[PDB]
């Protein structure tokens, strides 16, 4: 009944949530690493490492892991975000320990063969080249670069081609040594899982993990708070049929008291697609404007990214490079934020947003995997897990006024960074946006 928690002598946290009537589960190891724990020449390591952990360990050869997992019908996966590195598995309950075993094995005792470390550099480039075809991904990488100017958060996860061709097996081993400390990781499980037994296996297969010499509780401040830098980066590209713009303002962080209120304001502005509509029975004035007299854009989407110590909140626009005056659409978006700031929003649309928000945060925690994803991320970046029940309370209590204050604090006399890719010729700059927004 709830999320059970236990700590190991080396700091490792074991966070569990039992699910009645289940015979399978998901277990994952979450580390407070990621690319924000790299430096300029380092950039790209954590991800590289991740690819390599699947190439073989001091106990199991690459193809030995594969065949072992497939014979019991489990699944192994991993990703790297700016804030963390995650390795996790899905398997029947009988195999829970066997999975915790392999997870620790791959995460720490990995071979990192130099031969592998070389064939990989090409796979990582191919990977990189695909991301460059996903404009939204591109536009957002740049936004992070100029918004977190010369800071950890500002660098991308994949890293520069440069570093991908120059990462040395020593870089890897160092990132491991430097970052992989017990007090910096959470082992999360949900499904058919006995909390106590999982705490045991945790000791047995993760006990051997180095403790930090200067341990800090999972939630406490990294060091110097990232700082939001107003800026703009226009990327002319006359060949693109569509132009992609992103406009952001310093947002909110995971543990912030106004976290949900920010997500609530995001929901109130919402999204829109020139073809599909808003996916709401009643479109906002912005949504209506966007579509009138020919369309002012192809689509727009509100976004709100969070980190433990910072946040980005804004709009992502997509225009036809040959048909739209980007300035026209930006005005309506600014006009909509001003509307929120001025209080002219109804009880009805606030409720719709709270409802949209509630469903998005809770009804979506269905599988053991989706649930582990929540336990894991919440604890490894915050130091606790707000239960579904608690999250429901946090959203349900938000008020029209709460939103209006939040809007006035964050969208009035505050810096804005921006990025445009494509037919840059019609995009207004940052001082224009700030003038109209603050106007």
């Amino acid at each position: 009944p709830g999320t059970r928690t236990s700590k190991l002598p080396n700091g490792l946290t074991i966070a569990t949530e039992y699910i009645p009537n289940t015979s399978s589960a998901t277990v994952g190891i979450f580390v407070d690493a990621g690319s924000r724990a790299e430096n300029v020449k380092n950039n790209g390591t954590a991800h590289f490492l991740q690819h390599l952990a699947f190439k073989g360990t001091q106990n199991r050869p690459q193809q030995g892991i594969e065949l072992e997992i497939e014979n019991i019908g489990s699944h192994l996966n991993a990703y790297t975000s700016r804030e963390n590195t995650v390795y996790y598995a899905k398997s029947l309950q009988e195999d829970i320990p066997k999975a915790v075993d392999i997870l620790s094995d791959i995460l720490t005792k990995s071979v990192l063969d130099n031969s592998a470390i070389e064939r990989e550099r090409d796979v990582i480039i191919r990977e990189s080249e695909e991301v460059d075809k996903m404009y939204d991904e591109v536009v957002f990488d740049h936004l992070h670069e100029i918004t977190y100017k010369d800071q950890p958060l500002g660098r991308t996860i994949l890293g520069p081609i440069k570093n991908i061709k120059s990462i040395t097996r020593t870089d890897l081993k160092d990132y491991i040594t430097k970052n992989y400390k017990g007090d910096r990781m959470v082992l999360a499980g949900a499904g058919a899982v006995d909390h106590e037994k999982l705490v045991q296996y945790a000791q047995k297969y993760f006990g051997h993990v180095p403790k930090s010499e200067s341990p800090v509780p999972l939630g406490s401040p990294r060091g110097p708070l990232p700082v939001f830098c107003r800026g703009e980066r226009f990327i002319k590209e006359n060949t693109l049929p569509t132009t992609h713009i992103a406009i952001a303002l310093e947002g909110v962080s995971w543990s912030a008291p106004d976290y949900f209120v920010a997500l609530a304001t995001q929901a109130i502005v919402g999204n829109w697609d020139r073809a599909i509509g808003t996916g709401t029975n009643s479109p906002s004035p912005l949504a209506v404007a966007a579509s009138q007299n020919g369309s002012l854009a192809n689509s727009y989407m509100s976004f709100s990214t969070s980190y433990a110590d910072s946040g980005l909140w804004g709009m992502y626009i997509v225009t036809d490079s040959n048909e739209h005056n980007v300035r026209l659409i930006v005005n309506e978006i600014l006009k909509e934020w001003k509307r929120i700031k001025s209080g002219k929003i109804s009880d009805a649309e606030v409720n719709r947003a709270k409802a949209q928000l509630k469903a998005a945060l809770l009804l979506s925690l269905d599988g053991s995997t989706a649930i582990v994803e929540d336990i894991g991320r919440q604890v490894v970046t915050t130091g606790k897990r707000l239960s579904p029940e608690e999250v429901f309370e946090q959203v349900d209590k938000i008020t029209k006024d709460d939103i209006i204050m939040w809007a006035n604090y964050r969208l009035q006399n505050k810096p804005v960074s921006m990025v445009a890719l494509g037919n840059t010729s019609t995009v207004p700059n940052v001082s224009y946006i700030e003038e109209k927004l603050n106007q």
Binding site: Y79, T80, S81, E83, V131, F140, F303, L357
Partner: peptide
Amino acid sequence: LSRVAKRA
């Protein structure tokens, strides 16, 4: 609700 940029 906006996703968390991840790379696999």
